Design a protein around this nucleic acid. Structure first.
Ligand SMILES: Nc1nc2c(ncn2[C@H]2C[C@H](O)[C@@H](COP(=O)(O)OP(=O)(O)OP(=O)(O)O)O2)c(=O)[nH]1
Ligand SMILES: [Mg+2]
Ligand SMILES: [Mg+2]
Ligand SMILES: [Mg+2]
Length: 539
DNA sequence: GACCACGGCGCC
DNA sequence: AAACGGCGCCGTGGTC
């Protein structure tokens, strides 16, 4: 290309280099742009940011987040990663995308700009006549990228002092548990080392090894296995409790307070838009889509996520989402009628399986039932259903029997989905998002049947993901008008921040936007709550 | 110090 | 072991 002075013209493709991957923490090392046979390099990249009307190019969202951190409204536009990801969701990194579609991902802003221009041209070529993928790009993925940039840059308020205090107390309890483990072992060891634990449990003590590890074939010490040995030694109980405490302490309690950004005062995740095989988002650096919720300590941790003073959190979660999506995709008359009557399958399974009235069904129980409903649907074995439910074998075969043909056309849709996948090489969501599943005609049954369960899950998980993304796209400008913020997405859930005076209005409107995003043959329902913290906002 | 594979486990 | 699906992070044991 011709080297031309900085500033590029309207609509050039950007390239940039960050000191590190996290846009909120990164130094912008270099910036450049490409257009009309010219390349333009910024002499000082922070100043040069102000010249651009949009970030158009590879990883556009990340540059926009960094721009927003600097008080600049620089929205992300076209991004070839999104085109590639829609062509094939195994396109997840610029390294792979570059090499597949006609360049090389280097460490020089100018080359990255030139690469972005030609990859766009090429990937746009590959999408000619792909009307549905084009619809998803223009109506979902491209505008979603601007919403995620705003979410990332806003971050969430964390109660830091509280988490520090909690750490000091959890440490004393951890030392009580490990002292007693060491007393039962007859000696100390590194209890965090699963290899050392293996030796202690199965070689030194008498315990039977009920399982091997996948890749290396060691005797397993997972909670599944240790559940089996709960009565067979007291020590196991102590280990499981230690595991829980150390997991929560090392993953959330200790790292999160150290991630508060000094300028914003807030905690900033990244929402990765080309990371999953199904069209879902992921969250990283720190993952805020797996904050504990389940155990009493998990609940304590979740209370650390709070509203700014004068604001409240609003938490919205889709009811029974993939079950509703299934009703629509399959067209099953019985499953449709179940949601038309306002039934709750999760509560009904809990009630059945624990043998209590619905009124007594607690959150712990509801989660257990989810495992069963989604397990069975997505091809769980009779054997593994027996384990889990803790019941005989032929009963599980009959349960899986009872589950299907209660909903006869689910099976017919599973079969239809697999034959299209075998013939075309890919399966698709309601909106035409594709996933290529190559192993459907594999000759090794295990490899074939795993490919099958991945294949028929994707249209269901992926359609739910499509719906949520579209709701976000529709909701965001409505929130801006009302002076509220979108903070987090957790697959079928949004967490917003609203000024106290507008909180109820905001909750009502977001609920409606989420429920009416794309009408199906069953109603979507959204549970919404409002509170000072994330836990209290879902009660 | 970075990177890796693995087991294990938090959430959806 | 259990072969529901989709993720990312931790502490290991280990290499370079
Ligand atoms: N295959 C599978 N999918 C799951 C599992 N847990 C959650 N999901 C998927 C399916 C759910 O519909 C979706 C949203 O998770 P939620 O915790 O919100 O469950 P759901 O919305 O169905 O129930 P809810 O009515 O919100 O309590 O994520 C699981 O254990 N297996
Ligand atoms: Mg839900
Ligand atoms: Mg949810
Ligand atoms: Mg792994």
């Amino acid at each position: 290309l011709e080297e031309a002075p900085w500033p590029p013209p309207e609509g050039a493709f950007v390239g940039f280099v960050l000191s590190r991957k996290e846009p909120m923490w990164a130094d912008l090392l270099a910036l450049a742009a490409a257009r009309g046979g010219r390349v333009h390099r910024a002499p000082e990249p922070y100043k040069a940011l102000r010249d651009l009307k949009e970030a158009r190019g590879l990883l556009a969202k990340d540059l926009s987040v960094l721009a927003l951190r600097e008080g600049l409204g620089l929205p992300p536009g076209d991004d070839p990663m999104l085109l590639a990801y829609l062509l094939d969701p195994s396109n997840t990194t610029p390294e792979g995308v570059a090499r597949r579609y006609g360049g090389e991902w280097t460490e020089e802003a100018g080359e990255r700009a030139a690469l972005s221009e030609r990859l766009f041209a090429n990937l746009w070529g590959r999408l000619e006549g792909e009307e549905r993928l084009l619809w998803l790009y223009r109506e979902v993925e491209r505008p979603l990228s601007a919403v995620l940039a705003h979410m990332e840059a806003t971050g969430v308020r964390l109660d830091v002092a509280y988490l520090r205090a909690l750490s000091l107390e959890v440490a004393e309890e951890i030392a009580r548990l490990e002292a007693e483990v060491f007393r039962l072992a007859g000696h100390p060891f590194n209890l965090n080392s699963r290899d050392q634990l293996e030796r202690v449990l199965f070689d030194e003590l008498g315990l039977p090894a009920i399982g091997k590890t996948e890749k290396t074939g060691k005797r397993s010490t997972s909670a599944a296995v240790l559940e089996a040995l709960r009565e067979a030694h007291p020590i196991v109980e102590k280990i499981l409790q230690y595991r829980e405490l150390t997991k929560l302490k090392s993953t959330y309690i200790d790292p999160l307070p150290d991630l508060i950004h000094p300028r914003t005062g807030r905690l900033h995740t990244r929402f990765n838009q080309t990371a999953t095989a199904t069209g879902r988002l992921s969250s990283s650096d720190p993952n805020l889509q797996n904050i504990p919720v389940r155990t009493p300590l998990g609940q304590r941790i979740r209370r650390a996520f709070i509203a700014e003073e004068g604001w409240l959190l609003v938490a919205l979660d889709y009811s029974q989402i993939e079950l509703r999506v299934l009703a629509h995709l399959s067209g099953d008359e019985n499953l449709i009628r179940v949601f038309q009557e306002g039934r709750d399958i999760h509560t009904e399974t809990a009630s059945w399986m624990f043998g209590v009235p619905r009124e007594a069904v607690d959150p712990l129980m509801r989660r257990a039932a989810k495992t069963i409903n989604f397990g069975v649907l997505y091809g769980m074995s009779a054997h593994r259903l027996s384990q889990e439910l803790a019941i005989p074998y032929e009963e599980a075969q009959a349960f899986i029997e009872r589950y299907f043909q209660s909903f006869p056309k689910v099976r017919a849709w599973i079969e239809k989905t697999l034959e299209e996948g075998r013939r075309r090489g890919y399966v698709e969501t309601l909106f035409g998002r594709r996933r290529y599943v190559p192993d459907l005609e594999a000759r090794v049954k295990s490899v074939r049947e795993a490919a099958e369960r991945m294949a028929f899950n994707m249209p269901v998980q992926g359609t739910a993901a499509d719906l949520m993304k579209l709701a976000m796209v529709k909701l965001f400008p409505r929130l801006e008008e009302m002076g509220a913020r979108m903070l987090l997405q957790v697959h079928d859930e949004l967490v917003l921040e609203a000024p106290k005076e507008r909180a109820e209005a905001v909750a009502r409107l977001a609920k409606e936007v989420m429920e009416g995003v794309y009408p199906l043959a069953v109603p979507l329902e959204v549970e919404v709550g409002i509170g000072e913290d994330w836990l209290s906002a879902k009660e």
